[PDB]
Amino acid sequence: SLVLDQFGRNLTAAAMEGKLDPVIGREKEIERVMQVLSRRTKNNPVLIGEPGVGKTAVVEGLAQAIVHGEVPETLKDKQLYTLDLGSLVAGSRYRGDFEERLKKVLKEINTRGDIILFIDELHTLVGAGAAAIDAASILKPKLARGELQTIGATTLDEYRKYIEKDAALERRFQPVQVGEPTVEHTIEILKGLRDRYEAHHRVSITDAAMVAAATLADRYINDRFLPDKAIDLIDEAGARMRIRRAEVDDEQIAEVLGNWTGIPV
């Protein structure tokens, strides 16, 4: 476990400790991910979607589900380790260092046998240690045969630019679309997240505040995507209220949006 802990972060342990935010309304996406992970070969889902729609939140919710034990028997008590390529490529100065580290990580995973790798920003896996032999080339034989469960995550544009330019690697990952939630789903997400933000900012957020945040964020802010597009308004209104001082209402959300976009709402 030592080799893994120095090149990655145990997401299941964090979920057990309660460090991950609740995930609401992603039952279908998590079920689809579990379905792909239970395959016999090529059991490597990749979460694809616009930036900010909840790609990493889906994996965090999967970790929480694994901790709670609601997952099927195949994924029961599996440890979800998020891999950080920066750590792998940090000390690799001489020839063979990066390959040695990656091979050691894979050997440890195989020996333990109860580990699911998670690679957010999977496009960084293409040509990581070299222009050639790199992380992708080393992983390809393991990924193809289904001996190494992995959950990738990328955006649409990054997937098209990098992953699709390497057909051999792109063949080994099953796309799992995650879409921008509707306004009602965003309201449910905000209601679920309310507790953590209230605790952090020591403020009270009303239901009208959540509804206003979701609706206004959908209506006015244009270049962003709803989940974070609305959590931003909620969090910034809470920050304003805490700085001034203890309640957040639709008026505060409207003020935050007006400062953001300049539209006098």
**161, 185 Cβ separation under 8 angstroms:** no
Q: State how far the Cα of 235 lies from the Cα of 256, in Å rounded to an integer.
A: 10
Q: Quick check: 113 binds other proteins (CB under 8 A)?
A: no
Q: Quick check: 26 binds ligand ATP (CB under 6 A)?
A: yes
| Residue span 144-173 as binding mask against other proteins, x where in contact by CB under 8 A, dash where not | x-----------x---xx-----xx--x--
Q: Closest Cα to residue 190, out of 30, 55, 22?
A: 22
Tell me if 56 is assigned to a ligand binding site: yes
Residues 6+ apart with CB under 8 A from 155: 48, 49, 50, 51, 55
Which tokens sit at 39?
């395959």
- Per DSSP, helices labelled H in 97-206 are 97-112, 135-145, 156-161, 167-170, 183-201
**Residue 258 binding result from other proteins, ligand ATP, none, given CB thresholds of 5 to 8 Å by partner type:** none
Q: State how far the Cα of 237 lies from the Cα of 216, in Å rounded to an integer.
A: 13
Q: How far apart are the first and last CA of the chain?
A: 54
- Is the CB of 37 or the CB of 193 nearer to other proteins? 37
Q: State how far the Cα of 154 lies from the Cα of 168, in Å rounded to an integer.
A: 17
For ligand ATP (CB under 6 A), the number of binding residues is 24
Gaps in the chain (C–N > 2.5 Å) come after which residues? 131, 245
Question: Judged by CB under 6 A, which of 35, 38, 56, 206 binds ligand ATP?
Answer: 56
**Residue 63 binding result from ligand ATP, other proteins, none, given CB thresholds of 5 to 8 Å by partner type:** none
- Is the CB of 228 or the CB of 249 nearer to ligand ATP? 228
User: C-beta of 215: minimal distance to other proteins in Å?
Assistant: 8
User: C-beta of 183: minimal distance to ligand ATP in Å?
Assistant: 14
Q: Which span sits near ligand ATP by CB under 6 A: 23-31, 83-91, 109-117, 244-252? A: 23-31
Q: State how far the Cα of 177 lies from the Cα of 29, in Å rounded to an integer.
A: 8
Q: Quick check: 126 binds other proteins (CB under 8 A)?
A: no
User: C-beta of 108: minimal distance to ligand ATP in Å?
Assistant: 25
Q: How many CB atoms lie within 10 A of CB 179?
A: 12
Q: At what angle do helices 226-244 and 183-201 cross, to 10 degrees?
A: 30
Range 181-220, binding other proteins (CB under 8 A)? 182
Q: Quick check: 51 binds ligand ATP (CB under 6 A)?
A: yes
User: C-beta of 176: minimal distance to ligand ATP in Å?
Assistant: 13
- Is the CB of 138 or the CB of 237 nearer to other proteins? 138
Q: State how far the Cα of 98 lies from the Cα of 92, in Å rounded to an integer.
A: 5
Question: Can you say which residues are annotated as belonging to the binding site for ATP?
Answer: 49-56
Contact residues toward other proteins (CB under 8 A) are 32, 34-36, 38-42, 72, 74, 94-97, 99-100, 102-103, 130, 132-133, 137-138, 140-141, 144, 156, 160-161, 167-168, 171, 174-175, 177, 182
